[PDB]
Amino acid sequence: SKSRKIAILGYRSVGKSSLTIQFVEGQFVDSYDPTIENTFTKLITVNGQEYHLQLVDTAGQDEYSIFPQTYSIDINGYILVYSVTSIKSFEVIKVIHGKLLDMVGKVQIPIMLVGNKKDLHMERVISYEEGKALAESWNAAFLESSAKENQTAVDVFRRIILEAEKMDGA
Amino acid sequence: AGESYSRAYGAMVSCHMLSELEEVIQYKLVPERREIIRQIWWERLQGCQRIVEDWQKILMVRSLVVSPHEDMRTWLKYASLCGKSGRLALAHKTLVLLLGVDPSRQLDHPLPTVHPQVTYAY
């Protein structure tokens, strides 16, 4: 068996809470208005091996919100989320990632960028290429998701567990 | 000490006796400091609460190097306190000790005038 933790970070009012809740239960609503700190548990099977994730929904940080330290010690996995329907959220995810790498030290850590709300094809303002390029600058994995395409959401979490799993060894 | 000072006075008395015992150490060490330590003893005692038991503890601590006749005022005030508390026997025996003689045994003779203040207290 194994245990892991994951912290989801990004601008407020983006896929963080919705994506987490879709993963853990499998339902999306407009409740759970702007959160403060939420914790959820889920067992997962990756590469034919068990993982126990304690997912953490974080309060959305703005461009000037100081980086909380509860997430800079024990998380060993970071989901960087930005809504594809807000360029400001995409700048904010840059700056929060920057503050994280500032505070977590140099250490190459499993980071993954997730552009959620891809189902809003009629309102997107960030392209797949933009996020892919930004992640490649970070050298982190990239994905798109929606709070109703639950399968992809599962993959998202799987990917981070894969992301640490491949990269923990080397 | 977390709740109130009134209950913490039962430990303030301990602090008092420890510090005064260090003062006994100093009194033994330095003859010239003896008078000033005696005066400090009197002052701090006057600054203490008027409790017979705690007074007895402090005075026993002070008695290690000082006989009663060297601090007649302190034992006179102690006897006065014992009289106030109703412990007439303790005050009477302390007065006899300070006098050196017991007028109860000498009812047919006047009081020993040699220590008039102690006679007044008796």
Binding site: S3, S72, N76, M103, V107 | -
Partner: protein, 748 residues
């Protein structure tokens, strides 16, 4: 600020050097800088400083070079525990350390584990959760099926967390035991030894809280069960596994259990370790019950695996059997396991690798069975005589053997004196060794009849070694240092010692080797103690020749403590001065020498010099009093006019030592001194460091000590000042000094 960054760059460059000494010195310099020079700045600026230091930690850890990463690890180790463990510190340091643990170098892994342990002791609020991850991560690696390096690293980090941060590890104890034993059975020697060490640490953790647990812990029984499972014949049939490894693990586990149940045996082993080298020990009640329940099973297992010829198995058996003896001498004496125990010990004594610890075990066994061992003395003695050089003949002997003799004397001593008398001159034929001196010291402390011969033989040895001449009724630096140290320390009698000092007064105080000078000074100062006591105390036993020798030695010692530039020699020489010396230090020339020494560049030498002269002031006020006045004048001058806080605190420190050691001079100058100190306290701006105010407060208290009756007038102003300082919560201001001052003031 640019100066700070440049100094950081110098530290980074120095720590990048592969030289271990250079890295250590750079780390210590950074430690000093952060401890003193960083505290002069605010806390947000301190956070920025930690950010810069973490950039320099990057710079040290940027390369994959083992030396560079070791230097970075030393950096992180140095920073932690010095200042408050701010959040950024703990976060960045933990993240950096997690990158290092699976390293291939065992040295880097050990350093990283110790760093993780001290980071846990950092005490920041996140600590309680931090370790809960690392332990877990470590435990996960124990569950891993491969990657010996990962298992090793997990084992060491678990050990360090258990040892250094017990409270937060005690909760994780329950999952710990599940995986620790699968870590123990790993074929790798190092992983097994480290894992049983972690088991040690956690078992002491369990013991520390077991008495208050109203319900017995199952951990000891579970560990015994895994031990026997290691000894299982059927379970040993698991292929892809060497039976010797499982037996070694089982023995190690039983050693753990015995030690935590046989704390007396650990005390004996600790005594031996202290003797050879030149902590708290607890015992578990429930483990004691378990061991006495199944002790014979342990003995049967140990004797069954005795026949194994693996060197490490033999080592463990020799390290374990004396533990059983200390645990239960009676079983060995009665059931006759003692016969095979002695036979095996003497049989493995003839192979070096296990012989070394076999001698330790022989001493332990001799103590444990303090009576029956007599029967085996004829054997042991001869073989130890064989270990020691015979009279005819590199003749370098292992230290451990000597230790055994000492311990062998602690139980059979009075019975074996008649052969110790023969065994003296062989060790004297071995040559100098710190173990030799220690064992001779212990034998002296045991039986005086042996003490006399020990003293005489050691005098002859020192006559041959240091003096190059026989006793009457190039040379290695370390050997001479040891010789002089033992000469000074251990007790002796006779006229010959006088000669020793005189030669050492002329040939070794001026020796070109620094350590030799320092040790010669210290030893001569020690050696003149009984002669000076006889001269001063026993005025009727005074020998003018001894007085002349004392004066000559002191004069040359002071010349050495004034001439040579290096600081340590002067510091040790001056500290060697004692009240015994004072009667002969008051002369004009010696007093002038001390006067000159007081004006030396180093600071602590000035402190000790002012203390010494103040102490001397009693007997000959004529020479010292005007010079004390002059030093007071200059101290006041610098305190008033020196713009560097360092100079001000130095001045205050000299004044404090002056008043402590020279009160009578200070009574007439009571007023101006206190006026100056009050003005110092009333200065609106503080110096760069708070040491100035601390020295001021200590000086105030030391002044009050003698001057209280007069100072009664001035008490109120300095009292309100002290009240203001205390009521300022943000000022540490060496608060013990402030309260010390307040107490002394009120008392005086």
């Amino acid at each position: 600020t640019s100066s700070n960054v440049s100094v950081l760059q110098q530290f980074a460059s120095g720590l990048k050097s592969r030289n271990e000494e250079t890295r250590a010195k750079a780390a210590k310099e950074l430690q000093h800088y952060v401890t003193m020079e960083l505290r002069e700045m605010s806390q947000e600026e301190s956070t920025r400083f930690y950010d810069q230091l973490n950039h320099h930690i990057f710079e040290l850890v940027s390369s994959s070079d083992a030396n560079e990463r070791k230097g970075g690890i030393l950096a992180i180790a140095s920073l932690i525990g010095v200042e408050g463990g701010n959040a950024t510190r703990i976060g960045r340091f933990a993240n950096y350390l997690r990158n290092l643990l699976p390293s291939n170098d065992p040295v880097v892994m050990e350093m990283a584990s110790k760093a993780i342990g001290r980071l846990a002791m950092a005490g920041d609020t996140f600590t309680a959760e931090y370790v809960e991850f690392e332990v877990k991560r470590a435990l996960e690696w124990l569950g891993a099926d491969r990657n010996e390096g990962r298992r090793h690293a997990a084992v060491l980090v678990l050990r360090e967390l258990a040892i250094s941060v017990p409270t937060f590890f005690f909760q994780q104890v329950q999952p710990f035991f599940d995986n620790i034993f699968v870590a123990v059975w790993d074929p790798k020697q190092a992983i097994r030894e480290g894992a049983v060490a972690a088991l040690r640490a956690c078992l002491i953790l369990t013991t520390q809280r077991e008495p208050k647990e109203m319900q017995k812990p199952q951990w000891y029984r579970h560990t015994f069960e895994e031990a026997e499972k290691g000894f299982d014949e059927t379970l040993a049939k698991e292929k892809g596994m060497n039976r010797d490894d499982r037996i070694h693990g089982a023995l190690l586990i039983l050693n753990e259990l015995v030690r935590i149940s046989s704390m007396e045996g650990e005390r004996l082993r600790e005594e031996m370790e202290e003797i050879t080298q030149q902590s708290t020990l607890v015992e578990s009640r429930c483990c004691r019950d378990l061991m006495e329940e199944k002790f014979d099973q342990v003995c049967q297992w140990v004797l069954k695996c005795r026949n194994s010829k693996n060197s490490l198995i033999q080592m463990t058996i020799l390290n374990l059997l004396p533990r059983l003896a200390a645990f239960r001498p009676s079983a060995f004496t009665d059931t006759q396991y003692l016969q095979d125990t002695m036979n095996h010990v003497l049989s493995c004594v003839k192979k070096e690798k296990e012989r070394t610890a076999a001698f330790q075990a022989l001493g332990l066994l001799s103590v444990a069975v303090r009576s029956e061992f007599k029967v085996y003395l004829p054997r042991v003695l001869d073989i130890i005589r064989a270990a020691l050089p015979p009279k005819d003949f590199a003749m370098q002997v292992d230290a451990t053997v000597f230790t055994c003799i000492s311990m062998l004397a602690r139980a059979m001593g009075p019975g074996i004196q008649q052969d110790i008398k023969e065994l003296l001159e062989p060790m004297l034929a071995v040559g100098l060794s710190p173990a030799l001196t220690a064992v001779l010291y212990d034998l002296s402390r045991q039986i005086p009849q042996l003490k006399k011969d020990i003293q005489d033989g050691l005098l002859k040895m020192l006559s041959l070694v240091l003096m190059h001449k026989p006793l009457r009724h190039a040379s290695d630096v370390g050997s001479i240092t040891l010789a002089l140290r033992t000469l000074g320390s251990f007790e002796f009698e006779g006229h010959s010692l006088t000669q020793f000092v005189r030669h050492c007064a002329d040939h070794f105080l001026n020796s070109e080797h620094k350590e030799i000078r320092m040790e010669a000074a210290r030893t001569c100062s020690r050696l003149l103690t009984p002669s000076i006591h006889l001269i001063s105390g026993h005025a009727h036993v005074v020998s003018q020749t001894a007085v002349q020798v004392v004066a000559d030695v002191l004069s040359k010692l002071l010349v050495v403590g004034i001439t040579d530039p290096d600081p340590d020699i002067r510091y040790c020489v001056l500290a060697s001065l004692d009240e015994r010396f004072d009667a002969h230090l008051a002369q004009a020339e010696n007093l002038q020498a001390l006067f000159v020494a007081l004006n030396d560049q180093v600071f602590e030498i000035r402190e000790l010099a002012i203390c010494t002269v103040g102490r001397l002031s009693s007997m000959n006020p004529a020479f010292v009093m005007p010079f004390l006045r002059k030093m007071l004048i200059q101290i006041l001058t610098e305190l008033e006019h020196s713009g560097i806080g360092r100079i001000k605190e130095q001045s205050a420190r000299m004044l404090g030592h002056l008043v402590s050691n020279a009160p009578r001079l200070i009574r007439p100058y009571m007023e101006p001194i206190l006026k100056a100190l009050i003005l110092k306290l009333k200065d609106p701006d503080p110096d760069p460091n708070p040491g100035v105010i601390n020295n001021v407060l200590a000086t105030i208290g030391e002044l009050a000590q003698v001057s209280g009756l007069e100072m009664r007038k001035w008490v109120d102003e300095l009292f309100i000042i002290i009240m203001d300082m205390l009521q300022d919560s943000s000022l540490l201001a060496k608060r013990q000094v402030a309260l010390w001052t307040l107490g002394q003031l009120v008392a005086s």
